[PDB]
Design a protein around this ligand. Structure first.
Ligand code: W2E
Ligand code: ZN
Length: 208
């Protein structure tokens, strides 16, 4: 029951999603190995993801979290990149979208930096890059990210360079403790704590 509504580039909603995408690009310590070398994107399309059942699944869990945390869902908008973006927008997040080997355990990972999620578009560590050219830095092939509504609730703060949340918590925050420019990354351990609200289709752009 998923439908995708195209946003117009003239729509304020397109513009504010694009701005979060572009303004949260940063350099990565791999020099571009996983995600490619770029400072910015060419945004090709932004679609709103509409699925009543998945939305209601999300809001149900959100109310549960909120009631366990002084009526505060601690809701954020966060990026997710995955080879499984098409399964996600149709069937929702679940345990098959978890990063089993992630540093905060087997859960579903999200980033404030769009460029961090870009590193997973073609798999962990960028996999073998784009299907057509086997290039992790492909400037031709169309990529997709999700910009998601995520319920964090009471988040366990991990300072740092499916499983369950830590007891008494609804999520984990990976707080960057070395790279002064990196934004936070977050993990949830229940697929119902995220809704894939925008599907963004883009290319990374070769620096001039
Ligand atoms: C089951 O699919 C995967 O193995 C997988 C692994 C990692 C990711 C992913 N891992 C992140 C880690 C930190 C910050 C952001 C992300 C993200 O957007 N995707 C997505 C899918
Ligand atoms: Zn390619």
């Amino acid at each position: 029951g998923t439908i995708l509504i195209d946003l117009s580039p003239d729509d304020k909603e397109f513009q504010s999603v694009e701005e979060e995408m572009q303004s949260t690009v940063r350099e990565h310590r791999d020099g571009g190995h996983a995600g490619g070398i770029f400072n910015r994107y060419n945004i090709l399309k932004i679609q709103k993801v509409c699925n009543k059942k998945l939305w209601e699944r999300y809001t149900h869990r959100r109310k549960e979290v909120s009631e366990e945390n002084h009526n505060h869902a601690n809701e954020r908008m966060l990026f997710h990149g995955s080879p499984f973006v098409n399964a996600i927008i149709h069937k929702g997040f679940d345990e098959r979208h978890a990063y089993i080997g992630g540093m905060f355990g087997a859960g579903i990972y999200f980033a404030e930096n769009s460029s961090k999620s870009n590193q997973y578009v073609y798999g962990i560590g960028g996999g073998t890059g784009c299907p057509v050219h086997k290039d992790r830095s492909c400037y031709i092939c169309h990529r997709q990210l999700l910009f998601c509504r995520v319920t964090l609730g009471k988040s366990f703060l991990q300072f740092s360079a499916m499983a369950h949340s830590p007891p008494g918590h609804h999520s984990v925050t990976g707080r960057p403790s070395v790279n002064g420019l990196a934004l936070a990354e977050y993990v949830i351990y229940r697929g119902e704590q995220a809704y894939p609200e925008y599907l963004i289709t883009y290319q990374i752009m070769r620096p001039e």
